[PDB]
Every structure is written in C-alpha cells, then in structure tokens.
Amino acid sequence: MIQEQTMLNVADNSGARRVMCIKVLGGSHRRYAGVGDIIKITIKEAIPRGKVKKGDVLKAVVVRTKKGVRRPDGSVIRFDGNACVLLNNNSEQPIGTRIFGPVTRELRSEKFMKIISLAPEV
Amino acid sequence: NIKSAKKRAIQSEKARKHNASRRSMMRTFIKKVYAAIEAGDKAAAQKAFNEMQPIVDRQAAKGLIHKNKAARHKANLTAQINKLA
Amino acid sequence: VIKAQEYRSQELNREAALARLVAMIKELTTEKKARRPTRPTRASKERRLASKAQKSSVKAMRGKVRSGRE
Amino acid sequence: ATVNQLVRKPRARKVAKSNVPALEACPQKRGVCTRVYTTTPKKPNSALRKVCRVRLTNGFEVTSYIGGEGHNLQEHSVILIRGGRVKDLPGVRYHTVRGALDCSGVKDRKQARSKYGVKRPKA
RNA sequence: UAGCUAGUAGGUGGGGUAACGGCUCACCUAGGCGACGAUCCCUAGCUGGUCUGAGAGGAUGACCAGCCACACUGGAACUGAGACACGGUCCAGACUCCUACGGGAGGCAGCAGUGGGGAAUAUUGCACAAUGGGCGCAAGCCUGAUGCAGCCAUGCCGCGUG
RNA sequence: CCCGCAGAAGAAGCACCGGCUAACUCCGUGCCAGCAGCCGCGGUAAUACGGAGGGUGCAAGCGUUAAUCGGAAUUACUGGGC
Ligand SMILES: [Mg+2]
Ligand SMILES: [Mg+2]
Ligand SMILES: [Mg+2]
Ligand SMILES: [Mg+2]
Ligand SMILES: [Mg+2]
Ligand SMILES: [Mg+2]
C-alpha cells in the first residue's frame, strides 16, 4: 500500500533519501502499490553529489513495505519501513549500483533480476 | 591476507587467546588481593599476596607482562597491606 | 487561450477576445529593426591620426642617436 | 624609521600579483574558443586585431589574442594559450601559440617561424 | 579573530605506563592561559640545503640525506623487543568485481602500467655480477632496495657536420 | 678502449637587425594587413610590418611563455621618506 503522497526510503545508492510516490503506474484509478509494483515518484530529498538531484521525477519499484506480502501459504513479511529502488524513467534499469536492506521474491521477475542480484537477502 | 606469512594471523590469535586467559588469571588473583585489602584484614591481604606473588612474577618472566608491572603491583600492594594492618 | 469578461455582454466580450488576439499577434510577431554596426567617423579618424603623428614627432626628437656625430 | 616602531609592527613585502592569472603559474593552458572575431585597438592603432574568447581547463574564461595574418579558429577549436599582453586591446592578457592544437601557422612565414608555428620550407 | 579555558590550573589520595606526568579516577582550592597576541580562521610537512644576492636579506624545501605523518575513509585493539602495523587482524563505511546466493574478495601514496587530469613527465625490461637487506651454521634462496641497461637535447659537460 | 676508413664522408639550425641592444638595404603593403618586453611602427623611399639579400648573436640547440631572486635604496636593519 504505497499510494500517492507516500514518502519512501531508498533501498539503493542512487542518491535519494526520501522519494514521494506521485502516481501509481498501471491501470486507471489503481490505488495501491504492492512490492513488485512500479510507481512514479519525485525526489523530495537527495544527498549532495548523488546521481539524481532533488526534484527529479522518475519511476521506482517498491521493495519493502510496512504492510507486507502474504506468501502462497499464508506467511507474511512485514518490513518496518516502506522503501523502493529507483529506476530509469525510460528503461526500467535501476539507477543505483549497490542495494541496501533485504528484498523479497515477488521481486524475482525479469526486469528486476539486476535488483534481485544486487540485493543481499531473500 | 596476501603472503604466506599470514600464517601469522593464526600464530598471533592463538597467542592472544592464551595471553588473555593468562592476564585474566593474573588480575583475578590481584583482585582477590584487593578484595582482601579493602575487606579489613592484613591476614587475608598477605594470604592473597603470598599465593599471588609467584603468579604475577611468573607471568612477568613469561614475557606476557613486563617485570616493572609485577614490580609496581607488589610494591603498592605491600603498601596497602602495611597501611591496613 | 484568452478569457474576455470585462464587458457586460457576450456580444462585447466576443470582440474583446478577437481584439486581444490580434493585438497580441501584432507585437509578438514584430520584426524589430536590425541594428547595423557603426564605424568611427572620418573626422575622428583624422584627429586620431593627427594626434598620433604629433606624438610621433615629439617622441622622435625625444631621444639620443649618433647619426651625425661619430 | 624608528626601530621601535619596526619592532612593534614590522615592514612587509608587497606581494606582486601576476598579470596572467588564468595561467596561474602554468606555461600554457588549452581552451575551447567559445567566440572568435575581430576587435578594433584602442585610441591610436586603428586596426582590427583578431581575438577570441576561450574557456580553459581551469574554468578561467579569457579573451586571447590571435597572432598572425589569417587563421582557422572556430567555435569549438582546442587551442593553446601562452601569456603576453597585447598592449593594444584593453583586456587581452594572453595569446595563442600558433602552429599547434588546430591552429594553423601563417602562410609560409620565412622569418619568425619558430614563432607563429609554421614548418620550415625543407630547402 | 580579544578573550579563552572546567579535567580546566593546581593540591592530596587511588589507579594506570617501560617510564614522571589530570595519563586516568574521587575529592579540596580557585585557578590557568591571554597584547611578549591567547583563542578562532586561512596556509604549510620541518631541517641540512637550494636559487638569487655584494651582504643583510628575499624566495624557498623538486633531487640526496636527517626528523615527523599517512597507508581507500573512520575507529580499535592483537601479537610483538618494537606497530596501534603499506603489501597483518576486527568493525563500520563508499566504491568495484566474483560467485556452490550461503557468501565472499579488494585496496598501486612499491616497480612497471592503464584510464583520467594536465601544458607537462619514461619499460607492463635485465641481473641479483658486485653491493647492502632478511632468513639460514653455512652454502643457498628471497629482494622492482640496488646494480644495470629502456625512453625523453630534460639540464650540465666534451667532440664532430671537415 | 685499442689497429686498418678504400671516400668527404651520413651530420647547422634558431632568434634579432627602429632605441633600449648590435647587427642595414631593396622589394611589397600603404591606418590596411599586421608587429609590439617598454617607448611605439603602419596613410607609398616603412632601417619597426611581410618577403629577399645581407649583417649581428648563440648553437645541438634557438627562442616564446611560465616561476624566483637581482637591478628594486620600490618596505630602506645595513639602506628611504613626510
Ligand atoms: Mg593521583
Ligand atoms: Mg586511491
Ligand atoms: Mg598496496
Ligand atoms: Mg620473489
Ligand atoms: Mg621587417
Ligand atoms: Mg622614497
């Protein structure tokens, strides 16, 4: 449930620190964003010499949610903080080089193979 | 972690384990002494001192500690002993 | 896009709009006059060369040279 | 004067500033020549000296003279700059080493050919 | 840049170092520094020297040698005669690359070299033949220290193009 | 390093030439193009520009631009002024 106006941490080293979800991509009047869901965000705060400056607008894929995905059996994984990985706005292609924090298996899709490799856990 | 001579990591950490054990032993005997000393009996004080003198002196001779450390320990501990009585 | 509402009647605002549009274009499309460069005047060049030559004369007779006297 | 006054507040050395700041103690600096045109000298010399406006590899955008008769310096030519005032155009405190870095030498300068960067007529 | 300082400045005691020492701790006192410039800010490795100069001085610290400091950044110890350690340990960190996805691994400010920077600077060389260096009783091995050559009119010096 | 080399034999450029600073003529250009360390040269005989000839000077180098000290007694203590 990463909807509009949701401030997100950055689970990689792109440069941002908090980014506001400004639109949930995919479908009309779609409200929320699970883990694998891509969102449109803007950088509400970036570190000084980051790869992206504050104010930019670009896509991002969620990787950690306070809500938590339910596994096929009924097991849930509720992180403590919503955080996403930045993506290029034309190619998916995450911007950052490293990736912090854990991730899940709902990320184990084609375009996010790079993310799931760089990611350390799950 | 480049050359051979990083056997030295083992050759040094094994020594550190043994050395820490020995230092803990030494200063536990010295703390026994100090406990006797603050307790209030030159009897127990000198008791611990006798049973600790070979310990500290041997650990000094073993190159673990330096002999001046045993010196200062024996000195001020004898001093505390005699001021208590 | 133009919003014309100052008058009290749509038949008046409907020409206020067209007036605003044509008056906009007539100056947003102007071809401002092109400023060609200007060259120093003949008399100014003559005064420059005059001063230059008088300075040349004084600076020439101001010096030291053994043309005549060996 | 007044050895006591000198003792209290001593005499000093006026640090003589450099008349080629963009060189900052470097013999030469390359530039991109963001402009290239002609400009008329000051009062007496009544001519059109060829000048350029360059952006060096040390951020110092400077106006630089263009030596010789004729050249092929353009908007994006990697050039090389030495010191030396023009004494004529107020503001030009530098030059260009002709005959290196895209700059051509004057046409077959027989004299001053080490300057103006022209190869020799092999004889 | 006119005030700064509170473990601060001392005292006593306890502790601690190889060693005295607020080194550290607990008390007692109000110290303690500061126009002879404290403090704060900018700059900088220091010296023998070097260049200039008549001399004082001015600029200065590339080579060689003496001393200090640092080892990707931050911190810490360990072992040790000696390190809080260039080619060791642990943690953290940014970066980068691997993977039997659990884990890792790395630190050219050594030589050579690459990319990059620049106006600008050289071989991914040879020998351990002397020298020194460590190891070893020693022979003998290791040594990109060195000794040599590679390259550049980069300086000084000498001879030729008659 | 040392003994034969049959043949000059494969081997001089660079700057300057108005004054400071030394070393001069012609040509072409004619405020143009250009030169310039400072003063400055250039409007038709230009010793200053470009070329040729010639001269001056250094030479396996020659100059240009850094950069420092000197001259600079222009931070003066030696060794200055009001
Ligand atoms: Mg004490
Ligand atoms: Mg580095
Ligand atoms: Mg290294
Ligand atoms: Mg070896
Ligand atoms: Mg001439
Ligand atoms: Mg005076």
Side-chain angles (χ1 to χ4, degrees), chain A residues 78-99:
Chain A
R78 334 206 287 278
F79 302 89
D80 295 321
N82 311 322
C84 73
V85 190
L86 300 207
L87 299 176
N88 179 276
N89 201 0
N90 280 53
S91 45
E92 301 327 287
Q93 291 316 312
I95 318 174
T97 44
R98 297 299 147 254
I99 280 176

Side-chain angles (χ1 to χ4, degrees), chain A:
Chain A
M1 306 211 183
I2 314 307
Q3 66 170 13
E4 321 286 317
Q5 303 287 115
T6 307
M7 289 288 219
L8 295 199
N9 296 345
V10 195
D12 75 332
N13 67 288
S14 63
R17 282 318 176 221
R18 307 209 84 213
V19 292
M20 209 181 68
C21 164
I22 71 173
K23 185 55 72 173
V24 175
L25 293 193
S28 175
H29 198 239
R30 166 164 194 166
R31 324 170 183 288
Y32 304 121
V35 177
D37 301 337
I38 285 177
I39 54 180
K40 194 77 163 196
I41 70 175
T42 184
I43 308 162
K44 293 310 189 196
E45 175 174 347
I47 60 181
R49 275 82 60 193
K51 297 172 185 64
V52 289
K53 303 298 111 169
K54 188 212 67 181
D56 296 330
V57 54
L58 49 86
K59 294 168 187 156
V61 53
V62 192
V63 298
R64 303 194 288 274
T65 79
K66 277 198 64 185
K67 187 69 177 192
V69 277
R70 290 168 53 77
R71 282 329 179 87
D73 62 81
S75 317
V76 317
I77 310 181
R78 334 206 287 278
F79 302 89
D80 295 321
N82 311 322
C84 73
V85 190
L86 300 207
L87 299 176
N88 179 276
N89 201 0
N90 280 53
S91 45
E92 301 327 287
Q93 291 316 312
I95 318 174
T97 44
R98 297 299 147 254
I99 280 176
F100 318 142
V103 304
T104 176
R105 322 274 168 168
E106 284 63 26
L107 213 55
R108 298 204 37 116
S109 282
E110 195 191 32
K111 54 177 70 156
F112 309 138
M113 278 298 93
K114 170 98 183 140
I115 301 174
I116 201 69
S117 90
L118 271 299
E121 294 90 11
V122 185

